Design a protein around this ligand. Structure first.
Ligand SMILES: N#Cc1ccc2[nH]nnc2c1
Length: 299
């Protein structure tokens, strides 16, 4: 059974997975993604390191592979991350001039989104912008531009492709009492009140065991920021217990603006946290109990 088909039947948009050429050409990943998932994200090939390793010298082969594979197989596409501190070339983080960095950031945003204009459902424009206490994380953009880098990035993305849904995303948004969760809600509320085109909040749910239960309260709290959408991204759970995965699915069913869920990969040995076996398919590419529990919950 396909959890994408089943979650669509319940009124949601997709069940998705992060992947890339390295996985789509090995094992049973292509077959599983064709059968079970309705949306794909490039895990690495769209990041800044990969796409613009030298300023103005772009490298799109790997991202082109993913986009073309998705279109050929009828999958929705998410992509990112346009602006965050991860995968960031040192030629970007060493820039000290404000106007210089604004223009570099706008050009990176505009070039990537223009190349795939009309083909991308969701762009993660800004990622991991918050510290754990809810203050803004000090990356080169905050250091050099200031807090306006986030409005500027979304304004620029909206101008490049008005068809795409523009997300901010962060991790450790999984507990409704945690300071980082209420802070991103408070900030996104103000950005939207000021006309900034943030269409979504993406919760990067790299979860420890047992955290699924708290998502039932944290996800509606994120939705109270009033973005058109919220999404579950980078989902994995240490131990992969059905209890956690069913809790996460129930949370997205409970939140009307939650359009879908994206798991961080297909099979355990391809996880960056493989020793915690946190995904839905095992090392033989067979579905695990957590996969079956999601199927049964959605039926
Ligand atoms: N799942 C997922 C995922 C992985 C990498 C990303 N970069 N930007 N958005 C992303 C979403």
């Amino acid at each position: 059974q396909s959890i994408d088909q089943l979650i669509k039947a319940r009124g949601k948009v997709y069940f998705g997975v992060a992947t890339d050429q390295n996985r789509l050409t090995t094992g049973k990943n292509a077959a599983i993604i064709k059968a079970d998932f309705g949306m794909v994200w490039p895990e690495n090939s769209m990041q800044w390191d990969a796409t613009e390793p030298s300023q103005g010298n772009f490298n799109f082969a790997g991202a082109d592979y993913l986009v073309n594979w998705a279109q050929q197989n009828g999958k929705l596409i998410g992509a990112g991350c346009l602006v965050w501190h991860n995968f960031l070339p040192s030629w970007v983080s060493s820039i000290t001039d404000k106007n210089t960095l604004i223009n570099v950031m706008k050009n990176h945003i505009t070039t990537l989104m223009t190349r795939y204009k009309g083909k991308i459902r969701t762009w993660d424009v800004v990622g991991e912008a918050f510290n754990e206490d809810g203050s803004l994380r000090q990356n080169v953009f905050l250091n050099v531009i200031g807090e306006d880098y986030i409005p500027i990035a979304f304004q620029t993305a909206r101008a490049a492709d008005p068809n795409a849904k523009l997300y901010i995303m962060d991790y450790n948004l999984d507990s409704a009492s945690y300071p980082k969760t209420q802070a991103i809600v408070n900030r996104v509320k103000q950005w939207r009140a000021a006309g900034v085109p943030i269409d979504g909040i993406g919760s990067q749910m790299h979860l420890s065991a047992g955290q699924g239960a708290g998502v039932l309260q944290a996800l509606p709290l994120l939705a109270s920021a009033g973005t058109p959408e919220v999404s579950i991204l980078m989902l994995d759970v240490a131990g992969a217990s059905p209890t956690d995965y069913v809790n996460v699915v129930n949370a997205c069913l409970n939140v009307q603006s939650c359009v879908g869920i994206t798991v961080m990969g297909v099979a355990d040995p391809d996880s960056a946290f493989a020793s915690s076996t946190p995904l839905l398919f095992d090392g033989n590419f067979n579905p695990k109990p957590a996969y079956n529990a999601i199927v049964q919950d959605l039926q």
